Amino acid sequence: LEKMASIDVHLRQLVPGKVSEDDKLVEYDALLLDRFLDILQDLHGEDLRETVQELYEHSAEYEGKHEPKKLEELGSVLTSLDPGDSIVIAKAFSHMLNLANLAEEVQIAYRRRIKKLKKGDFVDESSATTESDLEETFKKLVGDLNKSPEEIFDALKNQTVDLVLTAHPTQSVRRSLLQKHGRIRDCLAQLYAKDITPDDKQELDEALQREIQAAFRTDEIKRTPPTPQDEMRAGMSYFHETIWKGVPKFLRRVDTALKNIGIEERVPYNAPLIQFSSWMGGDRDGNPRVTPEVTRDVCLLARMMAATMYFNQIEDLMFEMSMWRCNDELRARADEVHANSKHYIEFWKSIPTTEPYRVILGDVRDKLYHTRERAHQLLSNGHSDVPVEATFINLEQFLEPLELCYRSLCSCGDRPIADGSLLDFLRQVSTFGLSLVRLDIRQESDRHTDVLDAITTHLDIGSYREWSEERRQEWLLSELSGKRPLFGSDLPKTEEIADVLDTFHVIAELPADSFGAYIISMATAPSDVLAVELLQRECRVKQPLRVVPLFEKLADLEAAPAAVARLFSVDWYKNRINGKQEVMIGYSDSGKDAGRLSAAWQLYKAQEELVKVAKEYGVKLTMFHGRGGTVGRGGGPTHLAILSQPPDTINGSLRVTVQGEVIEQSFGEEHLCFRTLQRFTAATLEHGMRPPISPKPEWRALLDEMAVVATEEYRSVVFQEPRFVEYFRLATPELEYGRMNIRPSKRKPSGGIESLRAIPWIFAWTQTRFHLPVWLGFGSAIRHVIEKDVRNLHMLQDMYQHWPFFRVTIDLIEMVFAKGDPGIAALYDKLLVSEELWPFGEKLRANFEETKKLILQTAGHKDLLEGDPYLKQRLRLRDSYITTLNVCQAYTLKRIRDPSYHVTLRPHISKGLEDTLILTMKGIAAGLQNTG
Amino acid sequence: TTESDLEETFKKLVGDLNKSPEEIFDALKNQTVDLVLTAHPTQSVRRSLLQKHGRIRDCLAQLYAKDITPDDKQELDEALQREIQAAFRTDEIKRTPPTPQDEMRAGMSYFHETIWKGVPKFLRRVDTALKNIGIEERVPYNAPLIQFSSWMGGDRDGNPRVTPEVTRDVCLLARMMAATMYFNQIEDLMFEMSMWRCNDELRARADEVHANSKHYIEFWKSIPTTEPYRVILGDVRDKLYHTRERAHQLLSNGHSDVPVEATFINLEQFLEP
Amino acid sequence: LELCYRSLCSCGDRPIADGSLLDFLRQVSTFGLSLVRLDIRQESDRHTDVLDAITTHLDIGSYREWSEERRQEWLLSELSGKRPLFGSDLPKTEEIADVLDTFHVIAELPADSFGAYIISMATAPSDVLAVELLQRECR
Ligand SMILES: [Cl-]
Ligand SMILES: [Cl-]
Ligand SMILES: [Cl-]
């Protein structure tokens, strides 16, 4: 069998050059592809393997030269398959793509960094190969900015990176498949060690094939569109994978680099340099399955996982903490704890007072066990019997004895011992707390409007809905300044109103350690924030959540600093916020309203103005970056994006969404996790002391014109074109995506793109390799300013080379274009769109090509991603696998929607099209990862 | 430095003695090395110091890797000093002339150290070396090429501290440690066994086990019949837990309440599923 | 028990039903599930203190200074209205918390256990209205 010779050729034709000297990516992918196809032949026959290989060879042939003949060949084969062979081929290409992603992660993890490749400016910070590590960022602050070491250390102490993990917009990959992927990565890595013996290599190859087959032989359908509890279980997998051990690894590295610049202290173990938040189970915005019980559930589950990991982790700590010399305080506490009544009988019959650290640590272990057991009982029943005094309820109870051990050990010169497992444990307690993640709530402001309208209607004051914004403000301010409650059990509650109030009741019935922020979707005016503050207090929330408005539409972004100023001017709100105010901006959402360029530039300006307001009133402004941003990309780019943020918008608290489509690339691997946490911490540290350049005024004026032209084009296409929605429902799988499910994709099932949610808007166009929501508007803007003045191109180029914000924006567009193909979208059109609607797509695709050519001119590139050949190489590798899933999805849709489209089937190939469709959706989605 | 490894021994038997690969394989099948662990003639080193010694070895090893970065080397050096001082600052005289139960606990440390993972690694290497002489089979998994016996708690010759209760104790402790390790290992085994295609016999057993009414709520709300290997293995996990808890009760009391039918008493019950 | 009595009478076994069964029924009726029904008793001055902390916390004045008719007015508007009176955000002294807790205990137990709430030193209708109000507002 010399089929292996052919796939070696096609891969080498797809990626011919070597982007370094350790570039083994083509080798890795060829190895995985050979093993997988062999497994495929063994399991489903020779004819099936030859069919799959012919399809892939044709797809790589397409992604090389883009001859539409190749697409016609792929389709010719893919329609002749009966549904069974269709499912097999789709599953096959999904898994091959996953293997390609693992090869990429190995390459990135072990690519040698080249110090002679850095240029010396901020552009270095846009790729992992040249970005500054923590110590390079330190020395850069010391050299260019004359910042003293002790200043850098103080800055680090009070800094916080808060990563918010979101549910996957499609398949949150199972925890088991995460582990199998990890095994495949490890086998792949060790196979290329320059010291492995032939028997080690044979057994490694055997384990690699073994794992690949294990992955291919598990189903990814059936059961339910996973309950939010299950989705949350899968989401927390990355703590067991890399993050739990990874946090203290990173922190210790910070300690080392601080030493390597003269700082003799360590980063205080309680300092929250890294924190994690979760939306899984808390985001209700247009999502009815997220009920109050779901929220209580995910809080309790998280507390169980936390207690569990602390329990298993603390035993090794007990083995290490065998000293006897100790502090008088610790001696007293050990004798005190020894006066009491089973969880260490395999280790020691009982812990003697001659190992006091083990005594106290054993008590902490016991309390941890009782905490897990208690939370389990509350989850599965509703009450416990476990005395809350026998558990840990707040973080200070947990930290107090551990800190006693640390101080005590330091009293006796055992500081080095204390800086071991004890230090890593303390740092885990500070990072993860009793809950691992803190839950963020999100809800439409209209739902609070419904609650308050039923409240006022019940009190015979009128309808809160009819009242003007200022009349609402008056009522809410008088009610907040008074102490008299609002309502009781005697309140006509609809289904939605009861859901809202019950949500708040659940928030009040749980520890405040479990919750982060309550976030108001579709925020427009101060009554929307005041409403939530009021409902919180009237639901008896003891320690109330900080209320964070999410300004989405364009006019809302223009109105935002005024609304935040009015809020800051009210004494009640100024006293409640205690000098901190958080505002959420959703790049994807704002782009859905007004196109991407206008949304970006409007968000930069809005952050500037909000900083002006917060400086006026002495409020520390923290910006929360939602899905779609430049800070949501994977890897290197994130660094520059953080550096690019407007000055004094971060201020020691960076809050970014870790989008589901990227979390594997950011935390799936040990090294990847370290370098992610590193670039977040270093980029935050530097931006706090080295703001990006203030834009030249001609840049701001130019961007204002471009924003105008862009939004005009975008809205004229998406909203004003009457026969757009029809095209949207044909040229795109949005309808099938909503009908299948994931969640609901429409707030109002009967409306238009306005009421369509942002995630399905981005997704629907991402599946067809078209990405309309990301680039529409750039074309007419760049075109218009180049025509208005010959020299304006030179200005745009100037910005791309010197203004970080503009560079990161244009770069993201460039990357999305690297993922795009107008011919595939044209294939979807040819199969699913009416003939009289064909020119509509045609013109749109013209806008694509022109915008592509225009973006290049701004960046000074002749090809796409000319400045980051590593990423270009990787995306080129994936596209060959994804394209097959494209043709298959298009023809599958034509087969589902039209039973009048009969095809001469081919006989089934060796040992319900909807399952195929879901496979292609998950595959294409997983391969394209983040766009906009 | 010059002794024959497993494969060099294979090649010497095949070349110099004209023994066929089949004969070597049968001889291996029916062969058994039974290693008997005896109590230490003085200090049976504590388990904590065994782990500290292991860490010191690991730091020393990684410090001389020809590919480590300056920061890794710096942090490894610090971890080595940390462990050396950690070892030196523990007392080893105080308390009791360790109860034979304690001496036995310390003796069994090496199963957790290297042996538990070490046995299947060695066996797998036997499989590889057998492939390299033409043998397509693996060494049968139930064939006892390696066995472990212990005198800790059983040798009474001129040693009155070894009472019958001491023997009962070390037997129950050993069954506990075994049940623990099987329980912890079968978790990862359950994550791996996510297939759906299965045997008619195994399908029957999976549907049958599904006919019943807690140890996997952090992983899966419940295991469905579309993951039958996870069904059978989850039941085995449950039986392991009941075995450990039962032995714990028998050790600490003298009776249980755990029905012996819900545990593993003999090896065939364990191996069958 | 009543089913048993009816049944025995059905078959002309009334004399039997008028025996231990009758004594049992009568004991169930006389003593109920508690033997006795507890009467609560508290001074009116303490309810005045609770209402004073409530009105002071609402910045409407001090219920203690109010005339008997002003008290009556406020208590009646509160009783006919549908908006509650106070919440957890309430400065409770030891005695004030004691009174409110008494009402909470009364709300958390079966009504078979209680008889009457009795106001020591009663002088004017505001004291009775006060207890009725606190009763309704402690659920
Ligand atoms: Cl659940
Ligand atoms: Cl800042
Ligand atoms: Cl014992």
Side-chain angles (χ1 to χ4, degrees), chain A residues 646-652 684 687-689:
Chain A
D648 291 330
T649 69
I650 293 178
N651 214 4
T684 289
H687 177 282
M689 291 171 161

Side-chain angles (χ1 to χ4, degrees), chain A residues 135 174-176 179-180 183 197 199-200 202-203 206 210-211 214 217-219 230 233 240 252-253 256 259-260 266 301 304-305 315-316 319-324 346-348 358 369 376 379-380 412-421, chain B residues 7 46-49 51-52 55 69 71-72 74-75 78 81-83 85-87 89-91 102 105 112 121 124-126 128-129 132 138 173 176-177 180 187 191-196 217 219-220 226-227 230 241 244 248 251:
Chain A
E135 193 171 346
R174 277 235 47 238
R175 170 140 145 72
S176 74
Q179 287 194 34
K180 291 179 185 50
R183 292 191 197 271
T197 88
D199 283 350
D200 296 344
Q202 190 179 340
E203 292 168 8
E206 280 287 302
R210 165 157 41 249
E211 283 301 319
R217 295 287 286 190
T218 74
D219 192 14
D230 297 333
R233 277 159 187 138
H240 191 255
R252 184 173 300 277
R253 181 49 52 91
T256 298
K259 302 247 185 70
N260 294 340
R266 288 185 182 266
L301 277 176
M304 289 181 51
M305 300 178 180
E315 79 166 87
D316 315 66
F319 280 115
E320 284 296 303
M321 294 288 118
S322 42
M323 300 68 207
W324 59 276
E346 283 169 29
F347 312 146
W348 326 272
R358 268 218 270 270
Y369 182 77
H376 190 1
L379 169 59
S380 287
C412 324
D414 290 327
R415 174 174 292 280
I417 300 166
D419 278 341
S421 296
Chain B
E7 187 145 341
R46 279 235 54 244
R47 171 140 144 73
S48 74
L49 203 68
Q51 289 192 188
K52 290 181 185 51
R55 291 191 197 270
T69 88
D71 287 351
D72 295 344
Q74 192 179 343
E75 292 169 7
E78 276 208 335
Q81 309 176 19
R82 166 157 42 249
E83 282 303 319
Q85 176 169 343
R89 295 284 285 191
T90 73
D91 194 15
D102 299 334
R105 276 161 186 139
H112 187 256
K121 169 162 152 46
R124 181 173 297 279
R125 186 50 51 94
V126 182
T128 299
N132 298 339
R138 288 186 183 266
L173 274 177
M176 290 182 52
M177 301 178 181
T180 285
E187 166 192 327
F191 280 120
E192 211 66 15
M193 295 287 119
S194 39
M195 302 69 207
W196 62 277
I217 4 87
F219 311 147
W220 325 272
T226 54
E227 293 149 48
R230 269 218 271 269
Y241 181 78
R244 162 159 66 100
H248 193 348
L251 169 59

Side-chain angles (χ1 to χ4, degrees), chain A residues 377-388 390-394:
Chain A
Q377 286 176 359
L378 295 144
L379 169 59
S380 287
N381 299 337
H383 64 319
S384 67
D385 59 73
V386 186
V388 80
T391 65
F392 285 139
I393 191 60
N394 76 324

Side-chain angles (χ1 to χ4, degrees), chain A residues 71 73-90 92-111 113-114 117 120-138 140-146 148-149 151-156 158-170 172-193 195-220 224-244 246-256:
Chain A
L71 285 189
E73 300 173 14
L74 287 166
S76 176
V77 176
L78 283 162
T79 343
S80 59
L81 308 188
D82 52 70
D85 295 334
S86 288
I87 299 184
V88 178
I89 269 68
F93 273 97
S94 286
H95 282 282
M96 297 173 221
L97 172 55
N98 284 333
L99 292 174
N101 276 316
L102 298 187
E104 294 184 7
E105 288 162 10
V106 173
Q107 172 73 96
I108 293 171
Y110 297 93
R111 181 172 279 123
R113 284 182 63 249
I114 6 189
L117 207 66
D121 54 21
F122 64 85
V123 183
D124 297 337
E125 323 285 359
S126 53
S127 171
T129 75
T130 47
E131 62 166 336
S132 296
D133 67 14
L134 192 46
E135 193 171 346
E136 289 170 354
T137 293
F138 280 10
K140 211 202 306 176
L141 288 169
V142 156
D144 296 355
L145 282 294
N146 284 310
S148 78
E151 295 177 11
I152 302 180
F153 179 69
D154 290 335
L156 265 182
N158 301 267
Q159 159 174 318
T160 293
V161 181
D162 184 344
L163 304 172
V164 178
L165 278 41
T166 55
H168 218 289
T170 54
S172 31
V173 157
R174 277 235 47 238
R175 170 140 145 72
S176 74
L177 205 69
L178 287 200
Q179 287 194 34
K180 291 179 185 50
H181 282 190
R183 292 191 197 271
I184 300 185
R185 274 192 303 265
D186 296 333
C187 292
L188 223 220
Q190 301 177 37
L191 271 167
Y192 290 82
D195 68 289
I196 217 56
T197 88
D199 283 350
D200 296 344
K201 181 159 152 185
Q202 190 179 340
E203 292 168 8
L204 275 174
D205 199 321
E206 280 287 302
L208 174 58
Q209 311 173 19
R210 165 157 41 249
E211 283 301 319
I212 295 170
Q213 177 170 344
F216 178 79
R217 295 287 286 190
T218 74
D219 192 14
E220 327 101 276
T224 178
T227 80
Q229 293 86 333
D230 297 333
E231 269 187 339
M232 181 262 180
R233 277 159 187 138
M236 311 296 289
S237 316
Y238 291 99
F239 291 105
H240 191 255
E241 280 281 301
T242 60
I243 297 176
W244 175 267
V247 165
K249 262 251 299 130
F250 170 68
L251 296 173
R252 184 173 300 277
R253 181 49 52 91
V254 184
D255 294 341
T256 298

